[PDB]
Amino acid sequence: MALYVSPIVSGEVIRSRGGSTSEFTPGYVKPKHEVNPQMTLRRLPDEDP
Amino acid sequence: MYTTAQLLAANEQKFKFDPLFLRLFFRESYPFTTEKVYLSQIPGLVN
Numbered sequence: 001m002a003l004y005v006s007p008i009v010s011g012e013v014i015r016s017r018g019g020s021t022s023e024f025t026p027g028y029v030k031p032k033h034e035v036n037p038q039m040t041l042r043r044l045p046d047e048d049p
Numbered sequence: 050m051y052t053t054a055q056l057l058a059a060n061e062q063k064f065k066f067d068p069l070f071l072r073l074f075f076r077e078s079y080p081f082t083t084e085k086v087y088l089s090q091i092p093g094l095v096n
Contacts, residue, residue: 041084
């Protein structure tokens with residue numbers, strides 16, 4: 001804060017401030033999915049008969 | 050080495066194959082588009 005150093009002593013020296021780092025590197029996602037080429041033979045729920 | 054041999058026509062050796070069925074009875078060919086293959090034969094019999 002400041003507290004009260006008297007005008008007869010030098011006083012203490014404050015450490016200024018600062019210093020904080022961090023890392024958040026990798027991440028990933030990959031939704032592979034199949035087309036199923038033999039699924040197209042039968043009738044889909046759509047595509048009215 | 051030093052031969053210089055010229056070659057004429059070569060044989061074929063086709064063993065034996067003559068269908069006679071895909072050329073006398075199965076003259077009609079239609080492709081598919083669906084899973085099922087229907088084949089009807091109406092029983093024609095009139096009085």
